[PDB]
Write a protein that binds this ligand. Structure first.
Ligand code: 7MJ
Ligand code: 7MJ
Lengths: 259, 263
């Protein structure tokens, strides 16, 4: 679960929309490394910082990012994850060539898959956003936690409200649920077909019922997907469906009309 | 709780359900119906109905009626995997490799839910009109109560893919590794477009040969199976059950190779 800088034959640092380093590991290959903090070795939380890593490494699914390990040496604490060549969802959505409707259709279903898996494993994201959806060179996605919203030990060691559920806006104490991530998914649905980010006075608008304008989407989007985002960004969390329920409607649809 | 009425359908078994599409039925028992033995039958069905995954068959319902105990599931138009590989129209590697990866995902799902198949074979791998697959249990090997109903007196009612340990004189209980062996043989048959061991003359010659280390003929599938899938099936059909990899382990090995060389 823990690696050494020496296990990497070569490495390069790339800054993206951040401060990550790509390295070629001997046996496994290309991985992304990020130094969480720099300073003297800790004494209080080092034991459970290695256990957090073990818990995350055991979330294995095709649509979910796998934490490969941790590098702890001479006052450095760094997480190691797999490499997604094309960066994140918005980078791919703002590219010159338009992403085919078929590929956008497949991405949505893969976001559903990864989300249904994490929920089934008792994991609530609370930070689902295009910046957290990582795309490989084959246009397949993996859900990541780059804002350390689920890495509580690693968060202590060292933000978009456009995707945040209204129940969480001006109510930090409310517990994040499966319905919190469904709301974020609806805004992700919008950002996919609109190919851009949506939108104190904004927060009260979103709390009243204001949502990203469907009319702002220029390119072609099915009426059925429009209805799916509307339903998922519903004010009452109880009215919103679950990811296995989104999947049982989206999968036949994708297979009949988009694949 | 998820019990179907015959009212929705028509007789054949094969029926169109209003609002749920075409379905295939299996009438397991025809005779006197009694409420006591039925809960055990309804509960087991509710148990299978909760194995929900894109690559595993979802039992939709049961029809417990007078003179009819039936299992209901969605009809897979192209039949089993074997019928598809043996068809006139040749299947390209991209489709075969996607089929292989679907099997792994289905099996990783079932194992993660504690389900050990015990009867993994091309006959239990079902295909739709879009060349996507589902893992079934047509032999009722996991259906303890429905299988017992299928063996009554008052009622009207394989070898090539079995692990060496189960062919053995010892014949211990199945494991996850038992299914990994079955998978290795299916991998070979996907690339051979036929059942293994054609050159076998006697069943006991076969049984003793597998226990000794005989496996499907690798030379018959170098036309054309990548060296990667060959090493994989060789690893999955190892004599020692503890030396076989896990399905999530096989998934982490097959997914990157399929994306670069086959998709
Ligand atoms: C280098 N790098 C990482 O390793 C990052 N890892 C993940 O985002 C990660 N998501 C999962 C799956 C998961 C687990 C829980 C919830 C959702 C998904 N497992 N790990 C965190 O730190 C970074 C921060 C910024 C850039 C790079 C990194
Ligand atoms: C009508 N019909 C069915 O429903 C058949 N069902 C399945 O094979 C089935 N596999 C699973 C998942 C699963 C669960 C455990 C292990 C593997 C897979 N769930 N159901 C059984 O009986 C039949 C016999 C013949 C034709 C049709 C049917």
């Amino acid at each position: 679960i823990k690696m050494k800088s020496s296990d990497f034959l070569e490495s390069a640092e790339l800054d993206s929309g951040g401060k990550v380093s790509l390295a070629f590991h001997r046996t496994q290959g290309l991985m992304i490394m990020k130094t969480v903090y720099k300073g003297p070795n800790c004494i209080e939380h080092n034991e459970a910082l290695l256990e957090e890593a073990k818990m995350m490494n055991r979330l294995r699914h095709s649509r979910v990012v796998k934490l490969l390990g941790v590098i702890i040496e001479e006052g450095k604490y760094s997480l190691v994850m797999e490499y997604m060549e094309k960066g994140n969802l918005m980078h791919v959505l703002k590219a010159e060539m338009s992403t085919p409707l078929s590929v956008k259709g497949r991405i949505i279903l893969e976001i559903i898959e990864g989300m249904a898996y994490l929920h089934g494993k008792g994991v609530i994201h609370k930070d689902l956003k295009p910046e957290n959806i990582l795309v490989d060179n084959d246009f397949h996605i993996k859900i990541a936690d780059l804002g350390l919203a689920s890495f509580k030990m690693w968060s202590k060691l060292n933000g978009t409200l456009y995707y945040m559920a209204p129940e969480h806006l001006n109510d930090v104490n409310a517990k994040p649920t499966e319905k919190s991530d469904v709301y974020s998914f609806a805004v992700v649905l919008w950002a996919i077909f609109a190919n851009k980010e949506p939108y104190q006075q904004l927060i009260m608008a979103i709390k009243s019922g204001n949502r990203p304008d469907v009319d702002d989407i220029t390119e072609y989007c099915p009426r059925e997907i429009i209805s799916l985002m509307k339903l998922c960004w519903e004010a009452n969390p109880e009215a919103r469906p679950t990811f296995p329920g989104i999947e049982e409607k989206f999968r036949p649809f994708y297979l009949s009309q988009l694949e």
